[PDB]
Scaffold this motif. Structure first.
Motif, PDB file in Angstrom:
ATOM      1  N   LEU B   1       0.825  -1.202   0.000  1.00  0.00           N
ATOM      2  CA  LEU B   1       0.000   0.000   0.000  1.00  0.00           C
ATOM      3  C   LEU B   1       0.860   1.253   0.000  1.00  0.00           C
ATOM      4  N   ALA B   2       1.963   1.240   0.748  1.00  0.00           N
ATOM      5  CA  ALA B   2       2.867   2.385   0.746  1.00  0.00           C
ATOM      6  C   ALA B   2       3.460   2.618  -0.636  1.00  0.00           C
ATOM      7  N   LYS B   3       3.872   1.548  -1.317  1.00  0.00           N
ATOM      8  CA  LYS B   3       4.384   1.699  -2.679  1.00  0.00           C
ATOM      9  C   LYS B   3       3.313   2.265  -3.607  1.00  0.00           C
ATOM     10  N   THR B   4       2.091   1.736  -3.514  1.00  0.00           N
ATOM     11  CA  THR B   4       1.007   2.235  -4.356  1.00  0.00           C
ATOM     12  C   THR B   4       0.715   3.700  -4.055  1.00  0.00           C
ATOM     13  N   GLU B   8       0.850   6.833  -6.606  1.00  0.00           N
ATOM     14  CA  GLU B   8      -0.285   7.732  -6.795  1.00  0.00           C
ATOM     15  C   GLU B   8       0.113   9.182  -6.531  1.00  0.00           C
ATOM     16  N   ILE B   9       0.929   9.411  -5.499  1.00  0.00           N
ATOM     17  CA  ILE B   9       1.409  10.758  -5.207  1.00  0.00           C
ATOM     18  C   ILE B   9       2.247  11.282  -6.363  1.00  0.00           C
ATOM     19  N   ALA B  10       3.112  10.435  -6.922  1.00  0.00           N
ATOM     20  CA  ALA B  10       3.913  10.843  -8.071  1.00  0.00           C
ATOM     21  C   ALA B  10       3.021  11.202  -9.253  1.00  0.00           C
ATOM     22  N   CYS B  12      -0.096  12.318  -9.158  1.00  0.00           N
ATOM     23  CA  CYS B  12      -0.712  13.616  -8.892  1.00  0.00           C
ATOM     24  C   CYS B  12       0.287  14.752  -9.071  1.00  0.00           C
ATOM     25  N   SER B  13       1.515  14.571  -8.581  1.00  0.00           N
ATOM     26  CA  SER B  13       2.517  15.628  -8.677  1.00  0.00           C
ATOM     27  C   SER B  13       2.847  15.945 -10.128  1.00  0.00           C
ATOM     28  N   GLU B  14       2.924  14.920 -10.979  1.00  0.00           N
ATOM     29  CA  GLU B  14       3.245  15.162 -12.382  1.00  0.00           C
ATOM     30  C   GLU B  14       2.215  16.074 -13.033  1.00  0.00           C
ATOM     31  N   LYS B  15       0.933  15.861 -12.732  1.00  0.00           N
ATOM     32  CA  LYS B  15      -0.117  16.684 -13.321  1.00  0.00           C
ATOM     33  C   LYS B  15      -0.196  18.056 -12.662  1.00  0.00           C
ATOM     34  N   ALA B  16       0.098  18.134 -11.363  1.00  0.00           N
ATOM     35  CA  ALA B  16      -0.112  19.377 -10.631  1.00  0.00           C
ATOM     36  C   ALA B  16       0.928  20.434 -10.982  1.00  0.00           C
ATOM     37  N   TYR B  17       2.207  20.139 -10.764  1.00  0.00           N
ATOM     38  CA  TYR B  17       3.268  21.132 -10.846  1.00  0.00           C
ATOM     39  C   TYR B  17       4.096  20.929 -12.105  1.00  0.00           C
ATOM     40  N   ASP B  18       4.413  22.035 -12.779  1.00  0.00           N
ATOM     41  CA  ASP B  18       5.373  21.983 -13.875  1.00  0.00           C
ATOM     42  C   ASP B  18       6.758  21.601 -13.368  1.00  0.00           C
TER      43      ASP B  18
END
Lengths: 154, 89
Positions: B1-4, B8-10, B12-18
């Motif tokens: 679950l931690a890996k998943t 998932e955080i990665a 979200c980050s790719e879409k959020a911040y340039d």
């Protein structure tokens, strides 16, 4: 409208004999014209049944005649003019719609079909509505096909 | 679950911040050491570019923006609609 005729020998007529022998009923297929019956048909002359011999190549070329230029489907209508026709036809649908609403509402239990045929709302709101929706759909959707098959292939 | 969750955080980050500072990249993904974040980036997400200590997320050419898709394809979708419609008529 065409016919062929040949004369009946007057000697045979004076003898009271039938001018020809009929082993086939083809000659009687076409009902003669009452004018011809006034103009001496079967007393001085007779009709000849007509058929048409047609060659297959003649038919291929004849079909080719009415074939529209294959580019004519490519000739798209100017967008502004097409849109103005759409606008006008839509307003016409509005007018026909209000007329038809009155026609459906004013219609009483004893609605006279004969009187309606003689005189209906805006000639006939339903018929014009149908024809106008048909033409509008056709024009819009052919313009659709044209613009986009151009988009793909050009 | 931690890996998943890290994946998932990665995402979200790719879409959020340039771009994202490497410190912030560690903080969001809770990586204990710099080399941990570097190894994660190298293996799971090679598309990420690390420039001047900030993770450069290669945002998609046209994604978040609306009406940024292909023209011919949409319009020929209209072909399908129109032609399939009236041919019945």
């Amino acid at each position: 409208v065409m016919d062929a005729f040949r004369l009946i020998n007057p000697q045979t007529m004076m003898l009271g004999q039938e001018p020809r022998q009929t082993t086939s009923n083809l000659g009687h297929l076409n009902k003669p014209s009452i004018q011809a019956l006034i103009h001496g048909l079967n007393r001085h002359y007779y009709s000849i049944a007509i058929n048409y011999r047609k060659n297959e190549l003649e038919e291929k070329m004849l079909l080719n005649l009415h074939k529209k230029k294959w580019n004519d489907g490519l000739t798209l209508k100017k967008f502004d003019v097409h849109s103005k026709t759409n606008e006008q036809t839509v307003q016409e649908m509005l007018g026909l719609a209000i007329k038809y609403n009155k026609a459906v509402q004013e219609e009483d239990e004893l609605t006279p079909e004969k009187l309606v045929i003689a005189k209906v709302g805006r000639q006939d709101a339903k018929k014009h509505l149908e024809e106008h929706v048909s033409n509008l759909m056709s024009s819009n959707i052919i313009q659709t096909l044209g613009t986009m098959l151009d988009t793909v292939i050009f | 679950l931690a890996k998943t969750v890290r994946d998932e955080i990665a995402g979200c980050s790719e879409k959020a911040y340039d771009t994202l500072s490497v410190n912030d990249a560690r903080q969001l993904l809770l990586f204990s050491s710099d080399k941990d974040l570097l190894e994660y980036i190298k293996e799971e997400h090679p598309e990420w570019e690390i420039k001047d200590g900030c993770v450069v997320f290669q945002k998609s050419k046209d994604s978040a923006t609306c009406k940024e898709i292909p023209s011919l394809l949409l319009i020929n979708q209209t072909l399908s609609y129109a032609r399939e419609l009236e041919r019945i008529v």
